């Protein structure tokens, strides 16, 4: 098959940005591209054909331009309704592939993660399983860190996380990390932590609590 | 005006088999591609293949040959889809689309609205809402956090609202992951001030339709 | 602008081959469909091939379906058209024609080129046969089966010009032509050089 | 299959004419655009009107198209002298296995020039053709305008379909235009009946010639 690979995995531009991402062909592909805009909760969107030619009901600062195997789209002047993802579709040889795509983000200045911790309610402490919530609340940019330590060990392979869409008001970001434990197993320890380093943090911060000690 | 309805979500079982439809109106259907295209959650997308609607002949990609079938009824303007053998792996949004007229070479015109499938071995059942307490030690910020979290239920989704939609602004309901037990599981956060923890009641409206179920859970210190 | 310019046909014999070119310039070549329409003599547009931009679709007219190939190089800006055991109502001016964007229902062809001839007759060269026609009253003389164009007639040796008309000719199934002079009021003066024949006839 | 246009069309300069473009339901019947194309005597077909009603650029607003049911028509305004061309409907067609239709095509004559009906003269095989074991029948059409005429042949009263070819129109010097019919019998026939007649047809009006042994 044919390799697209979009080379700005995620991109974060602001409103008036004259913004571009690639698209690379593994092998000669002529102008046989094609592009698609794909907002959240929302179907692919056909923007450019053939590399460059364009699509009636499109603004004009969409545009594409590569040939052979390099290709770029512009949006010369960033809008919010502009924030989605981005996919290149190749139609020289079977099968279709599409690229990795690019995502779109706002950028905005650095904010610090205001970190909680929430221990298991007794109520499901009774059903026999504990879970353990370190919530990340309004954050930017979006990477982060969390570690889980109980009694000052590593734990792994026993949380999942959970990250929101960036928000329409803010711009910022929130997570939240579930560790999930027996209750025989969560009453066998005491401190538990979750570790957070983010880039607004001259340093992680710990947020605690020991086991039925409120 | 082109318009391209799909079939509804389906939730299957594995080992069985499926038929997605997808609607063709307002345009001559004879004679355009109809394209198929898979797309995983927090994935990308995946070219299944294609189908002539005036002629039916296909194109199917190397990996999907022998899981997805094409056809199309002239009569009806509707292209379909039939997956066969299914798998956990097999559940993703599926997209229809008509293609190039004569030449499939021809960009993605005119998308569906796409079909969500989801396929598991799991019954559906109502979840099991438990507290975020805010935390005894509260001054974070003069602002606490607390919660709900809404544990083990199959399918999706469940809505959340907070004091019956009273309660929207600083509300996060996290997207749902998939427990190792092939279960969902999901959390809906909220900050309020730290002055108002004695004085104000918080309760989270959990609802989950395909089980039928309502919970209402208080939380507090 | 957009250039389009066709090459490779000639004559040929009822199943013989021959292979067309369409350089286009003035466009991003690779990003379009191509076609092939042809024109009999005197007739209309018939659709022939048709290629996509990838080369992975090509579509045939039922007529030629199992004679023809269609191609095209994309590096060479090039489009080609294979013709094998050519009959004689594959005569015809075979045009180059892009197909062009549309919204939708089937789009045009927005640019054609100049064409190329294509002729398939057999027939060799042979010496016309002229009989009088027998009559202000009309006289005149027929020239039958020849080929090929021209063939030139006078009456009186060029003197008599007032009233003569000499009708085109007609090509028959044969392949040969035929055609026709007469004139209002007699020797004729028929000439065909290619086969080195000149008759003189009297009505 | 092809779509159904008037063989020729005529309209005095400034006038405005129609040319008509019928097809069926697996064509312009099922829903394709119609598309028209302009052909100058030896030049390529050029594109006239796309997507039923469009102009492309350098079209001026005399040309207009609109399509409805299974037809097509293409309207022209203030008929000018450069008008003088082939016009060509064209649709794509479900049927077989899918194929580009064109329109038979129509030749649109500016009148400068009052009508003519075509002057038929025929002649009867030579007496020096039958004792080659020959006989051609020569119907000479001069005269006429538009440039445009039908020709049949009539043995007796029955018609003739066999041996029949017809040349083109041809313009003379004086801007009419003439043409030509052969038909090619054998000695026998030509004997075996009591007449054969030539019968050319100019727009409404029939001009007829007869010869007889």
């Known amino acids: 098959d044919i390799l697209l690979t979009q080379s700005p995995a995620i991109l974060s531009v602001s409103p008036g940005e004259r913004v571009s991402f690639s698209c690379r062909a593994s092998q000669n592909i002529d102008t046989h591209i094609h592009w698609y805009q794909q907002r959240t909760n929302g179907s692919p969107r056909l923007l450019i054909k053939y590399a460059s030619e364009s699509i009636s009901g499109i603004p004009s600062r969409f545009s594409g331009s590569g040939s052979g195997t390099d290709f770029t789209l512009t949006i010369n002047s960033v809008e919010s309704e502009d924030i989605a993802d981005y996919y290149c579709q190749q139609s020289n040889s079977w099968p279709f592939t599409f690229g990795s795509g690019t995502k779109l983000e706002i950028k905005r200045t650095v904010a610090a993660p205001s970190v909680f911790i929430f221990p298991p309610s007794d109520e499901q402490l009774k059903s026999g399983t504990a879970s353990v919530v370190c919530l990340l609340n309004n954050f930017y940019p979006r990477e982060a860190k969390v570690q889980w330590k109980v009694d000052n060990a590593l734990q792994s392979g026993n949380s999942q996380e959970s990250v929101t869409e960036q928000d329409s008001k803010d711009s910022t970001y929130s997570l939240s990390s579930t560790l999930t434990l027996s209750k025989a197993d969560y009453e066998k320890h005491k401190v538990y932590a979750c570790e957070v380093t983010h880039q607004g943090l001259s340093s992680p911060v710990t947020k605690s609590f020991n086991r039925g000690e409120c | 005006q082109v318009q391209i309805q799909q079939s509804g979500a389906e939730l299957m079982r594995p080992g069985a088999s499926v038929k997605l439809s997808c609607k063709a109106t307002g345009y001559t259907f004879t004679g355009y591609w109809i394209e198929w295209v898979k797309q995983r959650p927090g994935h990308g997308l995946e070219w299944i293949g294609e189908i002539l609607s005036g002629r039916g002949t296909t194109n199917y990609n190397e990996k999907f040959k022998g899981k997805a079938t094409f056809t199309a009824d002239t009569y009806s303007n509707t292209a379909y889809m039939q997956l066969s053998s299914l798998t956990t792996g097999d559940s993703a949004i599926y997209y229809c689309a008509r293609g190039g007229f004569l030449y499939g070479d021809g960009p993605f015109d005119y998308w569906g609205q796409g079909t969500t499938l989801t396929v598991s071995s799991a019954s559906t059942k109502g979840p099991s809402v438990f507290p975020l307490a805010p935390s005894s030690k509260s001054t974070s910020g003069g602002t606490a956090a607390l919660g709900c979290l809404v544990k083990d239920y199959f399918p999706e989704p469940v809505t959340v609202s907070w004091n019956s939609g009273a309660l929207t602004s600083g509300v996060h309901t996290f997207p749902a992951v998939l427990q190792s037990s092939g279960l969902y599981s999901l959390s809906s956060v909220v900050t309020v001030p730290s002055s108002s923890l004695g004085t104000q009641t918080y309760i989270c409206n959990v609802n989950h339709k395909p089980s039928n179920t309502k919970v209402d859970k208080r939380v507090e210190p | 602008e957009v250039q389009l310019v066709e090459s490779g046909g000639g004559l040929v014999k009822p199943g013989g081959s021959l292979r067309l070119s369409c350089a286009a310039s003035?466009?991003?070549?690779?990003?379009?469909?191509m076609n092939w329409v042809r024109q009999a003599p005197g007739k209309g547009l018939e659709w022939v091939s048709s290629i996509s931009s990838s080369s992975s679709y090509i579509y045939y007219a039922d007529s030629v379906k199992g004679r023809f190939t269609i191609s095209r190089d994309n590096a060479k800006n090039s489009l080609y058209l294979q013709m094998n055991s050519l009959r004689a109502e594959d005569t015809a001016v075979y045009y180059c024609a892009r197909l062009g964007y549309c919204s939708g229902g089937s789009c045009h062809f927005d640019y054609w080129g100049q064409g190329t001839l294509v002729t398939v007759s057999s027939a060799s060269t042979k010496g016309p046969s002229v009989f009088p026609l027998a009559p202000t009253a009309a006289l005149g003389c027929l020239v039958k089966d020849y080929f090929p164009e021209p063939v030139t007639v006078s009456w009186n040796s060029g003197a008599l010009t007032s009233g003569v008309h000499t009708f085109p000719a007609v090509l028959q199934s044969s392949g040969l032509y035929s055609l026709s002079s007469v004139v209002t009021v007699y020797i004729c003066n028929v000439n065909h050089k290619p086969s080195n024949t000149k008759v003189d006839k009297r009505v | 299959p092809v779509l159904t246009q008037p063989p020729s069309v005529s309209g005095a300069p400034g006038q405005r004419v129609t040319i008509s473009c019928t097809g069926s339901?697996?064509?312009?019947?099922?829903?394709?655009?119609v598309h028209w194309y302009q052909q100058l005597p030896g030049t390529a077909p050029k594109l006239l009107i796309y997507?039923?009603?469009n102009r492309p650029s350098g079209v001026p607003d005399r040309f207009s198209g609109s399509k409805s049911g299974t037809s097509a028509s293409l309207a022209i305004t203030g008929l000018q002298a450069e008008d003088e061309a082939d016009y060509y409907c064209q649709s794509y067609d479900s049927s077989l296995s899918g194929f580009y239709v064109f329109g038979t095509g129509t030749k649109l004559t500016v009148l400068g020039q009052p009508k003519a009906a075509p002057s038929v003269t025929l002649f009867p095989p030579s007496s020096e053709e039958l004792q080659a074991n020959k006989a051609t029948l020569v119907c000479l059409i001069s005269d006429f305008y538009p440039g445009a005429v039908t020709v049949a042949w009539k043995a007796d009263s029955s018609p003739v379909k066999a041996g029949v070819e017809t040349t083109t129109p041809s313009k003379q010097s004086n801007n009419k235009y003439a043409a030509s019919s052969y038909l090619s019998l054998t000695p026998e026939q030509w004997k075996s009946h009591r007449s054969y007649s030539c019968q050319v047809t100019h727009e409404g009006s029939t001009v007829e010639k007869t010869v007889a042994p």
């Open positions: 997507g039923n009603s």
């Open positions: 339901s697996s064509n312009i019947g099922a829903g394709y655009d």
């Open positions: 003035g466009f991003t070549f690779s990003s379009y469909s």
